[PDB]
Amino acid sequence: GSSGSSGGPDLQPKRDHVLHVTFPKEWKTSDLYQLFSAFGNIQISWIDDTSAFVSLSQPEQVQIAVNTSKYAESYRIQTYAEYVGKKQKGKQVKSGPSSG
Numbered sequence: 001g002s003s004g005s006s007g008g009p010d011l012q013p014k015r016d017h018v019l020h021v022t023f024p025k026e027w028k029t030s031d032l033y034q035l036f037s038a039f040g041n042i043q044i045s046w047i048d049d050t051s052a053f054v055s056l057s058q059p060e061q062v063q064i065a066v067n068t069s070k071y072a073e074s075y076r077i078q079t080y081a082e083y084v085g086k087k088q089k090g091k092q093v094k095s096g097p098s099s100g
């Protein structure tokens, strides 16, 4: 990093070790630390009442969390790149996402 290098002059993604997580509005930072305790130390960055980003120390841990979330029924997990690739959310259709 700021020590003297960024990996190269290329413009590839920088979030391959980061997840996006979706949950009921009653979930807390403590439930998130409990969910991701399987991967050691982490970092958490909110974006709504019902979703946040979560950083992990390896992309292998990201792949394991994305595989294991298929069995969850009180939360769900995807990569940062999946969240970006689904940004066209289309949440409601009564008039449009501009109105709900």
Ligand SMILES: CN1CN([C@@H]2O[C@H](COP(=O)(O)OP(=O)(O)OP(=O)(O)OC[C@H]3O[C@@H](n4cnc5c(=O)[nH]c(N)nc54)[C@H](O)[C@@H]3O)[C@@H](O)[C@H]2O)c2nc(N)[nH]c(=O)c21
Pocket: 024, 025, 026, 027, 028, 029, 046, 047, 048, 049, 050
């Ligand atoms: C602790 N939180 C926070 N949030 C959601 O994340 C948003 C950003 O929070 P934060 O990073 O702490 O930044 P701020 O210092 O800017 O926070 P702010 O002064 O707005 O005060 C906190 C807000 O978050 C709400 N909040 C706290 N605890 C809960 C909770 O259990 N559920 C919900 N749904 N909201 C909570 C407060 O009422 C206040 O408005 C933040 O704006 C919010 O969207 C959050 N979301 C969940 N589900 N759980 C949490 O533990 C938190």
